[model samples]
Target: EGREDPQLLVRVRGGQLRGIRLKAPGGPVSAFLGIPFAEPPVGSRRFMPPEPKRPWSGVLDATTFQNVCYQYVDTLYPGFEGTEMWNPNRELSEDCLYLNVWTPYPRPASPTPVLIWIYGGGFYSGAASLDVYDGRFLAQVEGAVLVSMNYRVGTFGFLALPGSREAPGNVGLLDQRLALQWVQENIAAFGGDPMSVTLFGESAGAASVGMHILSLPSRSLFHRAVLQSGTPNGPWATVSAGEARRRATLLARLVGCNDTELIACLRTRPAQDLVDHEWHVLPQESIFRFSFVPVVDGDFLSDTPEALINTGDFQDLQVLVGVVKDEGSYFLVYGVPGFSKDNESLISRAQFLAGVRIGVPQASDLAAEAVVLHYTDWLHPEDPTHLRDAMSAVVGDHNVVCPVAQLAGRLAAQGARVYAYIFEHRASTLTWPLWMGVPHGYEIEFIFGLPLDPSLNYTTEERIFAQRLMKYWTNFARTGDPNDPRDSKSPQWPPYTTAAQQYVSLNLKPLEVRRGLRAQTCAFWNRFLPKLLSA
Candidate 1:
């Protein structure tokens, strides 16, 4: 099909019509933006499973972004300054279910591997059109086809209720499945091999990916998955029907409605109003009041992802999963500081709250011993300097390290191809007034091949490290294994096994291929922490 613009063209592949963009050297590249994967989710069809997008006649303009789904912007960022808008070409609406694809070289014969990215923002905020997620670099520089999409979020997405017949909970996950199905049908037209697709995401995005793996509807959508800084062992990942109903009751009351007509009223309310109501519930609080995550609805998600994987109910897909070294450090930097103190008072408080110990004597001894070993090291003595760092490390380890290590062990035991990594490279962006090393989402800059610029002040060494990181990622996308012996400078990344327990530690110097470190931490949590808490 011909168009006014030379770069835009119409094409058909895999028995479906698609719009494509062509790229030339030193000129604008071709892209297909805001392509609808499913029929608009609105009116009576709102919150239902994504339906197939109807075909359009003639050439569709594959140039601009579509409207973003109804989501609240973080207004605390000074009128949402420095924030990326949803999409310039489209307004925010319930019909905002679309995907964008970037192809460096568009040819019917070019069968490049596809990388589908899921944006991260704790299951609430984020858009595919965000500047940081611009896939031009991934497509043009890395020589792969990149795809990103928007899904329903907040009340419009994950609102579980009592006997809600129109749609069940986890609509966000359902939207993702629809997008993957679209990719499988249409990506070939954009020079991407539909057969060789890798699903990748971080934080909440990673958690969503894990949920997708467990979903019966999504088993055949992708061949592999990469989960960065996320685990499936959380209450939000698997909630009881009673708990979901309770949350729905709270939500209905917040919206000034009663339980009798809660689900129906919510479905009929304007999408933006529902989003605003959700914001009202959480407000400026860092912690979420109601659980707004993927729930085990027994339809889309049969069971907890952890339980499914443990029972070998998952598909035989290659998986790469891990967390940052100082996962809790980001919380400390992000204005949550209680986790950054190893004081006896704080320890006793936490232990007591967690029901770790009943008697005061045991709690006092536990707190004192914790302070002595964790807070005051002879070599790294306790000062005002080391106090916060010591506390943050312990908290971070307990929250993230133990869970991830246990997850990796479970995956390995099931004979799934798994490689665990620990990103240890400390960022120079210490603008938070404290040195938290590498906080959460720091690896994103390196993975997406984006320069940290002023924030990180990347030196020559950091640039080289970023390049190596890209190589590892692209190689993994191409093959199931990330251990490609292409460049001599690349470190040997061994596959993780239960006995060997090898892991890649990304730091300033050469990466470490070590054993026992993660396992030791996991063992401590599994053996002692639970019993100590129970006693």
Candidate 2:
């Protein structure tokens, strides 16, 4: 019911909004869902940056979640319908620039740190309304304010027409920037310390966090960032201006918009029509390749992620970044039929070679062979099972792990406080095969304290592990150190450094300190692989 406590009413810049009180494991919590942060980007505002919410008159009832940004779901994939649990299950509309906030019930007398979440869906599909993203436990258990927002994806978000005013790219990121600005201006009303905001997310969301770190316009919005399984330096995270233009052209032509007013013509088309046809821009084998993506626009990105990182021109905020042990396993088991089997696990050597070519696209046949040679297991070279391992390893390193390792080192060397981890624990609730150990986004449930909900069949160990993770995450939000806020005791997550290169290993067992994660493979991807492609 909307009949909650009077204390649940929070007056933000847009006007007063009433939240509903709910029970959480830690304590009671007040949740304000579906608060508008910006004017809906519809019609003429289709590809433009977000504008301020013009302020409302009466108290806004924000007890329920609202519309998710427009996105298309691939319902055609058989045997993978279960994975769509992460996709949006709510109403999708162009008018979906809303955010949700959860705060301690009875309200904290003094403001606490705010943890804002961004979602990841390859920059194509994602929504904050998903059940796994409920912020109740995160805010209550951590004694912090939790917030999540919905932003445009696919063609609506990243359609780049270079030098064109109508579609200046990275509007999705601008959507995020506007939300952060709203937090800075109004989080105090919800008993959140805007000065201590931490931005965190997985996959493309992590990459978005990294891009915000690199972008001058987005530099000062948040003080800390946690990048999980993604980074701006990742090969597929962003595209060059020319590549973006090419994708934009392809999308325009596919929608039958061949006129000189390309942006206007495409904007007139239905949102679903654009998203449905966007995938046709890429080959079926390149399904993993996102058609529309953030680009190096001079205003937002200024330069490439590599060049900006080398010059040390970006913000060096407190950063916690990491990846799962088998980030690529999800792609292999779910997306590609060639890599998976009917029952048992077996990936042919031929399939492994084919995977390498897809992983290192545009590289020569010799370069692809070099990648295969590096990832190949010299001990069991002929084993088909080993080929499966090799394929996952190649894809993981090429996409996320290697790029993250390189960027972590760079951030450390440039005087930013950094902490890294590799998630190895797989929850029992997941339906995936055992071979897909800790695939992409598996760590998210733990990060958000999903195991604490007794309605689900989470084991005791899983609950305890999730509690430990929440402590680490909220502690970092509070003091820029994962070991601080001193409520619970676990292994010390040491600060990452260029020399020692140490990181914490998050697992079902006690946390352990490790060094030089995938050092050899990262060297191949970061140093040697580039040279192979250059010639």
Candidate 3:
């Protein structure tokens, strides 16, 4: 061995890899970046399940990131700002089935718990590169291996054709499963316990974690998970098999591809052409819309997530489900500016209900008005931000808040261990418009070991909350319970249940509440959500 922690080189199943050693507080962290878990889903493999990567002979440089699966250019989202908080590429390519691992121990001292993270970009764009998803802090602070992977997004990631080779959609989800399998097989070499893995992510990544909980193939892959601000229960979480096929057909037709060799045609199209040709599934005005994601294709995902979760058909695993205060503000900033200068309506009652159902299917105007009546009436009438804030609350509730809470209730009822929390910590330095409420990814700053952006550092109060929470997270990863009695001062996060519905509020100052945060509205949504889910 060279000197102590000098970026060790190791051999994996595929080839010999050279990783860079990073400095961390606990110990020197070894980062093996862009390690491919599966073959690139390119050429013949496009739109198909990923194939096992071919073994290589020579020493490979796993130091630099490989490439992002063909993805959307993000600059278009106005006032383009900055997370795992708002956010990649070797210039965006189709060769992006890569995973990164960071471990404080360059070699195995003991088999430590592993945390595999999945980044969210509505399932369209993201990367496992070290910059945004730096696991150094998570690894250093928690003394655990923090791993992140990049799966295909957009058309390449989730295209389906009923009865075609690509008939069953969610290859992206499959990619993650493959990565999980890789961790089980490979993480041990990095001093991580695959048996103790925790699959956690934000937004669509969180949604992906929930999907794994439902999909039959993903069972027993990870022991615990954290779903932040998104879930399979979210409105846009899944598409029907027929809908999946329809979109595939529409894309094929848009590109003049014959149905007979549809997969081949899709495989051969230029990456940019495919990226450009895919439909914008998310409509600008729709309050709740999920464009391209997993579908109930009868294979990996046998039924709708709601049906599955409602029937108690999910992995019996420990879970931490929580949301940011104003999550919808992240989505609404584009749709409802000044809430569009929106008044007390908070997203027209009809649209609010439409978010949970297909255009307000089962929600009564009374219930919808009941929501506005409860949330809006409480707001200060004189404040201009009140209406927008109120509407943003509904959008957040409909899109994520209620879905997470209700799903936790379902899981709790089904005998799964569940913990819930609300992330309200807003970094005073966070410049994103305040209306987005802690914006969508503020907690991540504290989740990792340290801040990625120096200027965006957390204050003393923020640091304590974030650090204590990290201990809870690491504790959960180590042992399915976040309560570490040894750590006396850390918050005693209680388990959640449908009846009590309590949650811990994570902010500059942290506290626990006996009742749910949005009790009345959560009750209202939970009342009709079963029917609304199918409507």
Candidate 4:
């Protein structure tokens, strides 16, 4: 089904790469898969910042997907069929700093705008080669270049030894920064405009985009950004250097290594050994706390994302930030044991409050009560069905929704040209109960234009919606505004400002503009909860 096309050969900085041609609904496209951007981060370079790829003499075959970075897979929803959809289906390895690119066939005379995609797995696990992330139609239908990359995750990517040159944290982000630089230097060869690059991501990938926006080294890499369902302002997004070191040493001890030669000793152990034990560093009650995450190392991340945003330390670029309506429903149905889509109504009010406390481990008893009281629809506060809704809101608002909303306002206030949305559309094929609504990450399929495939059996409405969605995204990528050309036949998406608070509601019925999504709940998490915790 795949074949070599002479037009797909391109000479990049490292050397020449020969890609393959693939068919799409709109047109044929050229796909360059598994192109390495950095040297393998193995052996002595395991925790160090990625080094540029060395030049090669012969033509490198970029036709097939490469190895995914090593990560723990069995712990997440084990024995479930759907878990494999997100798991790494390919072989895992430390030398996985590779990227894939898709360009419209015939090689446009003028370089097209570029959209780089970053995946989200809570910064613990994700691979660019996943079937859902395929970008064939996104490039062909939208008529823009699309790129996705794999970066180290979990222990190998984020272990922090504070002040040590060898094990400085945020190397995963550095891997992304290096890839951005690669795009800047070499994308022109692949029929993409290096000057017009848009960075987009979901979940941890979205948070990484925010981190890059706040990071000094990565601010100039792209001209625009789209954060689908995550942000750097989330409390679980980053940890202080001390906490990172504590967790690192704990992991070291767990793997039979002394803290004296932490970096060397950990490198010597099998990669899976570190991943298998990393979660043990966190206590049972603090399941929300991530063991190894981006650290405020005073270098790559000069300060916390909150401090950077509040003090106006971030770039003022074009940004689109949004989340689904029921972002927490997926976690409740799949993450917590004994809870499923069928048993959503069985959750008691007390269990809902306890879930809130566990979801936000730092909140005091009074603060937890306040959160439950605020999220509760007082009309039927004790109703079993209502408790289910309350628990979902509690988990999503604290961890994702509020943090993302707060960051959007901060970005708008700081003069970023911002547009926001709340995805209200859930796929007809998803087997979850209708009450689950649009859970976290359900929008990615539409964003990637997966509905265009005939074998997927998507309805006519979803296909049209996917087309419209890709146009809005690619339009913003081409020009700084989604409504740059008003004649596109799409609904008007007003800019998000502190006063207007405007956002689009994405659904199949009719795309409409709405304002102040969950304003009161956001107020509690962004404004009042901190004060309550302090008291």
Q: Which ranges of candidate 1 are over 4 A from the true structure? A: 1-7, 12-28, 79-91, 235-238, 258-260, 279-290, 313-315, 333-387, 426-431, 452-458, 524-535
Count steric clashes of candidate 1: 3
User: TM-scores of all models?
Assistant: 0.82, 0.96, 0.89, 0.96
By summed lDDT, the worst window of 10 consecutive residues in model 2 runs over 334-343
lDDT of 1: 0.66
Local accuracy of candidate 2 as per-residue lDDT tens digits, 1-535: 2665788788998798988898887689999999999999999999988998999999999998899899877564445634677777788899999999999887788989999999999998999988778888988887789999988899888888966888889999999999999999999998899899999999999999988898877777899999999998867888888888888988888888732389989889999899889887763355347888898888789889888877783235789999999988777754555655245457677777777777666668888888878878889876877888777777888899989999998888888999999999988898777777788898998998999999879999999999889988998999899895554565678889988999999977877999996888899889987888888
- Candidate 2 all-Cα RMSD: 2.0
- Supply the global lDDT for candidate 2: 0.85
lDDT of 1 by residue, 125-145 (tens): 667777657676567666778
Q: List, residue by residue over 324-415, the lDDT tens digit for candidate 4.
A: 99988777754444357565555777778777777777888898788877878889888878888777878888888998999988888888
Query: Of models 1 and 4, which has the larger TM-score?
Result: 4
Clashes of 4: 0
Instruction: List runs of model 4 lying over 4 Å from the truth.
Output: 1-4, 74-81, 258-260, 313-315, 334-338, 484-489
What candidate 2 gets wrong by more than 4 Å, as runs, is 1-4, 76-81, 258-260, 313-316, 485-489
